[PDB]
Amino acid sequence: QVQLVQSGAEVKKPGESVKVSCKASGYTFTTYYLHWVRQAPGQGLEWMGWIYPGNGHAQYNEKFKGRVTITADKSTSTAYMELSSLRSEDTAVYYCARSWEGFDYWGQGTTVTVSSASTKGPSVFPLAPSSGTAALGCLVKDYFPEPVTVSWNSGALTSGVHTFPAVLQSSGLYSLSSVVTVPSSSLGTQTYICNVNHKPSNTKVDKKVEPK
């Protein structure tokens, strides 16, 4: 079974380099081209280059101006993409992809964030229900990098929950709200707590959201 497994998420400052791996199995590594492709909003999918592991030949998208190096180790059936002189615009999901006629098998992707921002845990603020359906939530504000995880009542509450995608603020920090709709009648008797984890900052927050 053809499988391409990439290395984990990376966070870098401008000017640094990143090196992402792609471990191939289930086929003869030396007989197919292996490509790198990235995806971000506003440029979309962008082809970066290929390597042919049989002979180590590689070709790059000229737009990267030599910043990309793709290598392959035929002893371990692993390919690597190193991107140097990183800038914020290099923030994207990076994929390795095998080719035949088209890209037939893809890695799972590797998120690379490039930013001058420093690791910071979120502040978590209640979105109190005010005044037969009530909405309430938590504002998870000013964290870096992605991701955070949000649950309600330790995973007990899932119906009507909407955790919005994060938005990058002008500060370079991320923010999102997570909301839930519940019966208004339940506000006096049922406790609502949002549970927020941000692993990069070692943050675990629980915030009780109560009416005011």
């Binding site: 992707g109 005010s130 504002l139």
Partner: protein, 213 residues
Amino acid sequence: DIQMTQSPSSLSASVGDRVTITCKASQNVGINVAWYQQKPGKAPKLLISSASYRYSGVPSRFSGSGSGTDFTLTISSLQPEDFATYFCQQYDTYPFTFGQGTKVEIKRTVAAPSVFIFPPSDEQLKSGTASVVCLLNNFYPREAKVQWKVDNALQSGNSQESVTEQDSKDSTYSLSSTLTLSKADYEKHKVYACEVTHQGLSSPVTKSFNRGE
């Protein structure tokens, strides 16, 4: 590079519908075109290559056609698993290039949003910032105009929207619009309002509060 332009950028369809997505290359690319399907959080999946050949295992409802600059993907009878974003790509010349994608979403009956507004918490205000959150719950179609008014004056440039993917159970969207201000600016004004215009509402709905009440 060769620009690949897809039409439409999105479309709403029902199970059983015939769907047509076109892709125009800015220069001739022969038949060296592929089509892909992508679902949120996942890598693209190959559907068609060499313009018209289905990739191993791809169901016969998918078909590709074209040569030169004009390419078409047709899904003859849409299935539930086919709601996704579709991309074309050329591999005729370098650099290989991709289209911008066409999202195929689920058609359903119009559903007006429920609208809720949240003033900044005292906790947040203690820290020097103020975020006002407007929530639009479970609406369809996606198109919605959400405008902020502060003391009855229309705002520009100080709010951001975020939207969920179409709901697994009722095929609706939900949306947050957040107005972000310094505490200093927030406390100079009284009335904060979000006004929502949507096909499901006979007239725009406003939710508002007076600061501190």
